[PDB]
Amino acid sequence: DRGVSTFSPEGRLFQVEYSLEAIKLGSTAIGIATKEGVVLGVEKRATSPLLESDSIEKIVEIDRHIGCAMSGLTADARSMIEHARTAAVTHNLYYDEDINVESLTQSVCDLALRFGELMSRPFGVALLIAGHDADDGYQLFHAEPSGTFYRYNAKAIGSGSEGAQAELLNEWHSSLTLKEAELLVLKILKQVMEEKLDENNAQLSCITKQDGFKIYDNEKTAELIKELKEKEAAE
Amino acid sequence: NNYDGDTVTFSPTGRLFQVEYALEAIKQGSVTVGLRSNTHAVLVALKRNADELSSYQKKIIKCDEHMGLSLAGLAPDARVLSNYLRQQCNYSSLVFNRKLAVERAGHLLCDKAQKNTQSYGGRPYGVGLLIIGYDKSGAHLLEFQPSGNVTELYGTAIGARSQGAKTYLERTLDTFIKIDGNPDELIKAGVEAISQSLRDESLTVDNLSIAIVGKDTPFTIYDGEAVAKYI
Amino acid sequence: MDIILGIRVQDSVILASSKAVTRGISVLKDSDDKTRQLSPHTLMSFAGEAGDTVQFAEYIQANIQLYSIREDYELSPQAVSSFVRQELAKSIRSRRPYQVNVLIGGYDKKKNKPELYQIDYLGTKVELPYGAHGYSGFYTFSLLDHHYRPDMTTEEGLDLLKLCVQELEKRMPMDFKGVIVKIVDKDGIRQVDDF
Amino acid sequence: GYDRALSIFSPDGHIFQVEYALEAVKRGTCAVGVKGKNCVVLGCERRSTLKLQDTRITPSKVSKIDSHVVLSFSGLNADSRILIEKARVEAQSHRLTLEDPVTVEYLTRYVAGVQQRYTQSGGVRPFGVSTLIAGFDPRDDEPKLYQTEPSGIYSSWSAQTIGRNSKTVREFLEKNYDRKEPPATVEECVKLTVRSLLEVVQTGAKNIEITVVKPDSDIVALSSEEINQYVTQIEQEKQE
């Protein structure tokens, strides 16, 4: 056939480029960083009404100061999350401190290109890694299967991403409050989702310095959806 | 064509297509410039952003107190190679109480890259590096290509539109080599060189990345408002 | 761990095991159960070096429970004892052997017979009417040689066991803090709570 | 060792070996899982191409992983044994180190992790198997039903089916299963499970197997005659 680690004539790894196509097929995940916190939101996308939607775990805790949202082949993320959690806890053991969000992201991304003929193929999942540390404050990173990571003020990944990213382009400013960011994620999710947005097919989360990483209750998200509808009807 | 499936296969004209495709990834990468005098050596790098919400990808990596590089191409491969350089620099210090010569660092990168071009299963590194350093024989600038070819130079540039900066340096050769004991003027010449490779975009405060090493100057990177002086 | 006794009567096996756990100077506990249920009709008591005893017992337990799920079937007491013996016989030529002696009391549901096996840390297996490990047997075997009959009831087996425990309490130097007694029969395993 | 990357991405972002493993699951006999208020029932199809079978000794489709959790499957039978063995070992290992039996979610997550590992390991193909894992957590009376698949994704289901013509029985369950009021009793839950299989099975009672799992390690497999009574009552009500 052809090598797994083969370069194309344009200078790209075939497998990495093909894994990026799998991520486009994934459900939408959106992150928005502010000075009051970082908000992470996801489309759940239950394949059937009999599937108990609360078991869809696409937002995940890495440490108390670092959260993570995923899009693509979500089964591939479990070993990445495991490594992240171990890296966070191991660094605390060796240094008696929280680990920097960038350092954690860099550790996850070191796994990415460990594939060949090590694992047999790249990961088919992109991660939004959101967190807080004392050095660089509130941060949002986009970790790909290329091994590259970009910091973002806001970022969307998954099937609605280019549409969502254009919307995040207009809407994001440096003075966003946490409450504003929550509504903004819900707004853009509702735009790019196929099914109508509610508390059962979408999930919110955030990371603040005081309270750490928290996945929002369905009752709490339901109130923010009702608050969104009223403020859009308001003009 | 038929001879580009893997790195282990020569073409009928004696070419290694996988290596040449890796070389192509560098040309797609963002521009970076290297240049030196007798006292100092400077790296100037145009960082690239994904969009307006994103950060600008870091181009410059420190290897030791007296050495570091700038990258163009696959950033994860630069991380692997820079880490290898960090270890070799560190091994020289711990075992021999000796700072690693910049020429010898180039030789080590060449040999590491070469092994990936001759063996099956592996791939070539998809990145080009500009290594600057100050050692016991003064300032140095190296250009690393992932074919294995490392080249000591007075100045150079790699990445997209790098031929504009490279021509400028070729004209300015006799001027900038004489900028001794003046770091700001050497950086100016590097910032003016990298400007020849720009189209549409210009050098903003979070776009530009500069590094410097010299006689009584450790390898230090300048980003953000530290480079506003040179815009 | 100090005293473990076993006695096979007509229709059951009775295992008595001391309650004391002593670490050097102090008696740390006086209610320790030195036994594991391997299957519904097979019980293993154990005594030997600290740590090794429980680690071995639980390791055997896990393997017998795994066999039970895989085959949906309980291994015979004979089969369990042969498994245990092999593990100990493998152990003795290891880098660090398990220093554990065991009694395996079981009711074979196929043959409708109680069975008592005595295995030491070397992997020396013997089927017996009554058994003991360590210094217990020095005092108790002469009693059991005198009083034992194969057709005894469970209540007679327990009375004979009281006489063993009284003799041990009279003549042994160490205070072993009494015994927990367990009966293995056709209905399974139960603990005699007053002894 | 044989290191060859068999599970790899294609230009459209699909891992064909994982998708072809799902086609093996589509070929497999139908399996269904329905959870009531205080029970879970696992129904399974037995294809009647094979008569002269010895039903005493033939591998049963529902397997106990521990005394409180069961696993049924659709797909390659030989592949399922490997997952069942690994799960049974992990169930005992969990009891040994945590001093507590596995939760149904934990056991599912483990089996799903194994399935995932085979989609990005060199030299191996994915399991041609999807599982339904059902039971009750220790000291808990809430029913649990999970599904896994070759890719390694897993999720919880009020009711679910897998295997051949699972599209049809999922159609049935989607209209007949009410979440606000699930099958209150064991009878109602078994009835709904038999009814759902009767859409596809197209034969009497030899082709249906039923296993009821209740709280506190109370698992029982129904016999032919017990199932045949449900089949009789369903069709007599249907004639109207």
Added chain:
Amino acid sequence: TGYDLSNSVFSPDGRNFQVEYAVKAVENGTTSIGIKCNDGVVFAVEKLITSKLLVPQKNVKIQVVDRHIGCVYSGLIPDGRHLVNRGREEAASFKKLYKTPIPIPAFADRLGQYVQAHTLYNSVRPFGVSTIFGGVDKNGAHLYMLEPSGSYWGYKGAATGKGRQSAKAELEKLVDHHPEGLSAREAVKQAAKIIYLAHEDNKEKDFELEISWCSLSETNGLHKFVKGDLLQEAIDFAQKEIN
């Protein structure tokens, strides 16, 4: 067809096409030569000045093995470096065990067997270099040239790279016109001339001459680079002959 797609596959001719394709990479490289003289050997190489930004005298191509052997090569420069690194390991283990420095014929076979090994399997690529090497041992001077196939012979004069035909013709005149032999200092001058004459094949870019030598009288049998006045004397001699 398809016999040229994999290394170590015999074509119906009995040829290994991948080795022959490696030779094309060698033929594409810059010119390098070797001259055997009375009591030693001289190595020289053409270094193409791609740009004015190249630092003069810094990008050294000729490599020393042990203290008494010089190596120069044409083709893929990293492949040459990999081969010299191996040569250094072979020369080190030989000295470690047998005390004496490795003889040149012995050293030649060590490289020869290693290069030949890379034509035995499809999991490796042949070397993209022809290597000219040699030095002074207990039996006197020896010059060798080693091809991608693992083939090597002893030489009076050797040449490889893009200007090899030009160089070979010039070497053949020296052999005919000096049967009694050539002195070490003569060979340095002639080496400079031959590289300058061979530069007509790479005439687009200007170049930098680099020479080294081992000689029993002139260097005590150790490998040294030709530097300063002796290098300039050879460049002047070469510049005079082309005009």
Added chain:
Amino acid sequence: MTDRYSFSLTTFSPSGKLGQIDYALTAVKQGVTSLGIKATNGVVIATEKKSSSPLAMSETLSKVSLLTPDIGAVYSGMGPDYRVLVDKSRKVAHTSYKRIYGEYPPTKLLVSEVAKIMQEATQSGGVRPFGVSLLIAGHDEFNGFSLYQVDPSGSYFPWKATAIGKGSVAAKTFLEKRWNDELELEDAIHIALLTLKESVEGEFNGDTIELAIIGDENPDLLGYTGIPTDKGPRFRKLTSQEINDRLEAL
């Protein structure tokens, strides 16, 4: 410098054929004719010494090989593959049997071990099957005299008489007519020489024919005296002179 062939080179084709085994059998078919005949008091194995050049010393090339003192082998197909199998067969007779039980293996078990080696070349990674069929004749105390054929697949069958290679179809028909269960060893040798003459083109004498027997114990060939139980090898290779003697009574 890696062995990357960790996958089978012999695989099932859509029709259910194992191609490489069939092709190995085709190589055996091109090979020179060899045969085996079992008598009541012995076994004979025979083949043509097809000399590649008249300058070559065909005595040095042994197509008929001793495996144990009571077991011998002959082949048809590729000679180099046979030579290495004889080396492995001789060694396995010691390692997996004589060093354990203190006696040589019986014919059927040694055959089984050879068969196993050939089977493994049919399934292991990065190898082709052996391109030979063996005929193994031998004797042991509890089974008596026996003759086995071993194919590239690893399959083996016991024979009363058979032939393999070039003219095997014609030779097997010839043996069917002549074989009976009351043959003496000399009768079997006579039949072996008659059968082999049909497949041979050129010269037919003791120098171009190789022939060995598994027969009586040869205490003269033992090399030592003083142990009553060791009575000497049953395997004996007939000399060039011994063959020519029997060709006069032909």
Added chain:
Amino acid sequence: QFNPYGDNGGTILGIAGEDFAVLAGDTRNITDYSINSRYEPKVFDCGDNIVMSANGFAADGDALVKRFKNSVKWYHFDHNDKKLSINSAARNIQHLLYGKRFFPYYVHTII
């Protein structure tokens, strides 16, 4: 028998003030009743405003200080030139020391 340990003597002293700290050590290095050196520095600046001394067997002391200095260097590389806090340094030194739990660095360490 070869004894891998020795005793190079010396004494060290750390005192923590309100907004400062001192680490003192004598400069004598000895074996048995011989003086090796009258001035052999024992207390080292390790960077990041941390000072360290590993008194006892001088070979193990030097090895440890060397390794900790290197640990500071790699902390900078791996965590974006972040300053190693004294509490983090201390925990890192625990792992260096315990790493050789069954062939110890024969030293009393103070930072």
Added chain:
Amino acid sequence: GSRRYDSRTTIFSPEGRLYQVEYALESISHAGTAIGIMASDGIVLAAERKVTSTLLEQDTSTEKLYKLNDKIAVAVAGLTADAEILINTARIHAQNYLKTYNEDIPVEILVRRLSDIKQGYTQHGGLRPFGVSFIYAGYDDRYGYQLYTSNPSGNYTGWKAISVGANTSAAQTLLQMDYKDDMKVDDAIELALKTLSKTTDSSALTYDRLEFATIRKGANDGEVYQKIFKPQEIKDILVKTGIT
């Protein structure tokens, strides 16, 4: 590199089948028919040899029926050499179980182990599967008499009567027609030979062509006896049942 020559023996087709398993089954369909029939008081194993020659030494020959222990036997259909690799593994597995538990291995446990080995060759390693189908005939004190089959996929199932190898479709119809649950060994012997006699590709079924065996709990004093029939005994049972 080597990748070029790799058949990839352990992959799914687009339809979700294992190519090599399917082709191995095609191989097995050409092999000589083997039949197993389970009765209340014993099991019969009957099998047809493939290579009729007059010169084949039949009394010392074994291509079809092998002994695994004293309680369990197999009938082979496919590559004999492949089967012998697996048989020796199965023989060892039985003795390992006996050494560990001091009890004879239950039939299903031995069958599962072999079937698991076969499965492994279809999922990992890059090697071709074993081109073998087994009929396992055995007895243990849990389930009594048992018949199983395994095939190259590593799937196994239990049977009252079953065929493998050639003409199994025809053979399984004939068994399904004449089998009954209350049947006895002597009746099963007759059924097995009648089925082979009708499904055989040969002109007539003779003793020199057959391997035959019975497992009976009709040994002295309630033990189990494995009988591998000698050539003369196969000839006698052919005359008794009225086939020759």
Added chain:
Amino acid sequence: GYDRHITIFSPEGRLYQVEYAFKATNQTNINSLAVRGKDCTVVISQKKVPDKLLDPTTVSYIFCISRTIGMVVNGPIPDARNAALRAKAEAAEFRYKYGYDMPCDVLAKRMANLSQIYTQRAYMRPLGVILTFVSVDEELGPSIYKTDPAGYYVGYKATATGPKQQEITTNLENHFKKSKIDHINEESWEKVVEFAITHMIDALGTEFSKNDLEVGVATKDKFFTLSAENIEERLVAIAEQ
């Protein structure tokens, strides 16, 4: 058609890679010959130094494997030296382990078994060489044993290898048909070398100078190669009768 790239069977039962390795044998275009005397074994081979820049002393296809064994190769030099080094290693290891010098025929067998492995194992290619081993063995006397890429080997009374082997072979065949003996009935090796050269001249139809030939001689307890001057003496004697 990958059955022609690696060493697996074609449908005809052929190994094409082995057959193409045999063709690589004649790539040098050199003919070799070996004959046996009473006390000696002589091997001669053509020597062609086409380039004037070559050091003719280093151009050789005859190798001293051990003191007693010599080896001439027909094929490319890299494969020739691969085979030479291995044979030297094997001969030395044999002496160490078993306490006597490796016989010529045993070495030939060992090298042939190694060659057989390359025809069966896919990852290793065959060497494109024919190895002709010569000695005066202490048990068997004058000995010639030849190995090829198939892993075949056999002893010889005399032999020839190369593009024009058939012409040399038939010339030797015809001489031994006359004499009716397995060897050259001659006391001194000098005259056996003269025979070898004469019968190659007759067979190939070409005259030789001292630099066109290369000669190896095996005697009891040593194998040695002749210098150009030793060959010149041989050529003078041939011309003078």
